[PDB]
Paper text:
The cow antibody repertoire contains a unique subset (~10%) of antibodies possessing ultralong CDRH3s, which can reach lengths between 50 to 70 amino acids. The unique CDRH3 structure can be separated into two microdomains where the antigen-binding disulfide-bound “knob” sits on top of a long b-ribbon “stalk” and can bind to both surface and receded epitopes. Ultimately, we isolated a total of 8 and 11 cross-clade nAbs from cow-485 and cow-488, respectively, all of which had ultralong CDRH3s, suggesting only ultralong antibodies were responsible for cross-clade neutralization detected in sera. BnAbs from cow-485 were named Bess, while bnAbs from cow-488 were named ElsE and assigned numbers based on their order of discovery.
The ElsE Fabs all have CDRH3s with 54 amino acids and 4 cysteines, with a 1–3, 2–4 connectivity, Bess7 has a 61-amino acid CDRH3 with 8 cysteines (1–6, 2–5, 3–7, 4–8 connectivity), while the 55-amino acid CDRH3 knob region for Bess 4 (6 Cys, 1–3, 2–5, 4–6 connectivity) has no ordered electron density in the crystal structure. Ultralong bovine CDRH3 knob regions fold with 3 short β-strands connected by 2 loops (Loop1, Loop2) of varying lengths that can adopt a multitude of different secondary structures, including loops, helices and β-turns. The Bess7 knob is quite different from the ElsE knobs, with its Loop2 region folding as a long, 14-residue β-hairpin, with residues DEYA forming a slightly distorted type I β-turn at the penultimate tip. This hairpin turn bears some resemblance to the tip of the long β-hairpin CDRH3 found in human HIV-1 bnAb PGT145, where residues NETysG form a type I β-turn at the tip and superposition of Bess7 (using the EY tip residues) onto a trimer-bound PGT145 (using the ETys residues) shows that the stalk region is long enough to allow the body of the Fab to avoid clashes with the trimer. Bess7 is also notable for its interesting disulfide connectivity pattern between the 8 cysteines in its knob, with three (D gene positions 23, 24, 25) and two (D gene positions 39,40) sequential cysteines in the sequence. There is no convincing electron density to indicate tyrosine sulfation modifications in any of the antibody CDRH3 regions; however, BLI experiments indicate that Bess7, with 3 tyrosines in CDRH3, contains one or more sulfated tyrosines. Low sulfate occupancy or flexibility in the CDRH3 knob region may explain the lack of electron density for these groups.
Numbering used by the authors:
A (entry chain L): 1 to 9, 11 to 27, 27A, 27B, 28 to 95, 95A, 95B, 96 to 106, ...
B (entry chain H): 2 to 82, 82A, 82B, 82C, 83 to 269
């Protein structure tokens, strides 16, 4: 599994510059004509730079590429939140046909505004109770940074099993969202007095409650 | 150019994965069409491409299991990966590769440009001639111009990609349940509502709202893999609380792996 050498992670503040290196050898980057690609979660890879320095159609000027021997560099200026993605370099290895990629670099754009989570807890729907299932859905949105812990409580006591939580993922507005599920039987849902979804984030803990008596 | 991937979202372990790519808006007999994949948590991995006529080219580390054919008639290229494992579960992208080997003329070390070469040297041109001093024995040192080779490669356009899962588990369409807004679950002028897409396999699932006419405040979450081996996800949209009774909200769930589409109307609760 031969892969060009890229830094795992890089960072930069809004408006500032960042550089991403691509170290290889003389058979790859040395021969020149390195290319760069952007991969945003939930979208197909986009070609940014080719031929070391040439920009692809529709690519902003703030994206630029260079090369010094066996190491190429992607430079991104006037950084913005939308620039957070994985960036891969690539080149031909002694053959215009065969190509190798780099290990990939995740870009973290610093200085972005913080925001508290908005939590909504949904009880099991009637449709689901009819299939003899009961899932509690805790949706969390519009927070930054993308780091939360979720805890489930049943009658003011902790839940011992049945929880599955997604890793925070970016929304279209650049804030983060996350989801949590508590899978129960229709009996448990009716046995207890209330269920809570607790979302902790940057010193606040937002708790949303549901009870079958309200339904 | 449009690059559409087609094929199974699911292949059983140690069997063959067959994918097809339909190119729309290009001839298939010049532009190189290649395959690139990305396994979860791993880097882009080159697989192969087919050039003019059928000059196939693969990854040295995967050429034994890879096979790429081409049919200019139907404007389609195919990929085949044999004896697949969980490591071959990945998004497979159809792409148009631009292969090119630029050539440049040069002289050896110590030789310079000159017009002294005889015709018997067969250099194929008056300009393709080199000279490097006068040797004490051989005399005027003549030599033809050496031709270098600059390799050029990059991906011009990317298909949307097709997600392939290697598993013995069978396909299962989704069960879509409403996440209805409630008198207490509102946030003033806005109300969160959504759809729970439960117990499907394999990935992926996409969700729109009102056939795409509604996009503001929509977010479909990543899926969770449950102990049952089935996936579930939710899609939420933020709407005006005052429109719950009058405006209709329908989530359009697409699960291509099972050729299933579900439209579920989300009614407001009386609570």
């Amino acid at each position: 599994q031969a892969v060009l050498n890229q830094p795992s992670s890089v960072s930069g503040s809004l408006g500032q510059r960042v550089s991403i290196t691509c170290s290889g050898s003389s058979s790859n980057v040395g021969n020149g004509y390195v290319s760069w690609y952007q991969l945003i979660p939930g979208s197909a890879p986009r070609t940014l730079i080719y031929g070391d320095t040439s920009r692809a159609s529709g690519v902003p000027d703030r994206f630029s590429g260079s090369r010094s021997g066996n190491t190429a560099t992607l430079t991104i200026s006037s950084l913005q939140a939308e620039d957070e993605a994985d960036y891969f370099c690539a080149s031909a290895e002694d053959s215009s046909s065969n190509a190798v990629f780099g290990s990939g670099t995740t870009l973290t754009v610093l200085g972005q505004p913080k925001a508290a989570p908005s939590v909504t807890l949904f009880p099991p729907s009637s449709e689901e109770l009819q299939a003899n299932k009961a899932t509690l859905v805790c949706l969390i949105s519009d927070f930054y940074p993308g780091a939360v812990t979720v805890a489930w409580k049943a009658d003011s006591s902790p839940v011992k099993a049945g929880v599955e939580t997604t890793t925070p993922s970016k929304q279209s507005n650049n804030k983060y969202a996350a989801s949590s599920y508590l899978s129960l039987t229709p009996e448990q849902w009716k046995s207890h007095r209330s269920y809570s979804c607790q979302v902790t984030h940057e010193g606040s803990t937002v708790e949303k409650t549901v009870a079958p008596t309200e339904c | 150019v449009q690059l559409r991937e087609s094929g199974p979202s699911l292949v059983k372990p140690s069997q063959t994965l067959s994918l097809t790519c339909t190119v729309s808006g290009f001839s298939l007999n010049d532009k190189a069409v290649g395959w690139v994949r990305q396994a979860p948590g791993r880097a882009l991995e080159w697989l192969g491409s087919v050039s003019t006529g059928g000059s196939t080219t693969y990854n040295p580390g995967l050429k034994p299991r890879l096979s790429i054919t081409k049919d200019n008639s139907k404007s389609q290229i195919s990929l085949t990966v044999t004896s697949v494992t969980t490591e071959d579960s990945a998004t497979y992208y159809c792409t148009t590769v631009h292969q090119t080997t630029k050539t440049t003329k040069e002289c050896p070390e110590g030789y310079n440009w000159d017009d002294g070469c005889g015709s018997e040297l067969g250099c194929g041109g008056a300009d393709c001639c080199c000279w490097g001093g006068v040797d004490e024995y051989a005399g005027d040192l003549y030599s033809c111009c050496s031709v270098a080779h600059t390799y050029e490669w990059y991906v011009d356009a990317w298909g949307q990609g097709l997600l392939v899962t290697v598993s013995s588990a069978s396909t299962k369409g989704p069960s879509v349940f409403p996440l209805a807004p409630s008198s207490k679950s509102t946030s003033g002028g806005t109300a969160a509502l959504g759809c729970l897409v439960k117990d499907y396999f394999p990935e992926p699932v996409t969700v729109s709202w009102n056939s795409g006419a509604l996009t503001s405040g929509v977010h479909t979450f990543p899926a969770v893999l449950q102990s049952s081996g089935l996936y579930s996800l939710s899609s939420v949209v933020t709407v005006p609380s005052s429109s719950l009774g009058t405006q209709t909200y329908i989530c359009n769930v697409n699960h291509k792996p099972s050729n299933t589409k579900v439209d579920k109307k989300v009614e407001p609760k009386s609570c």
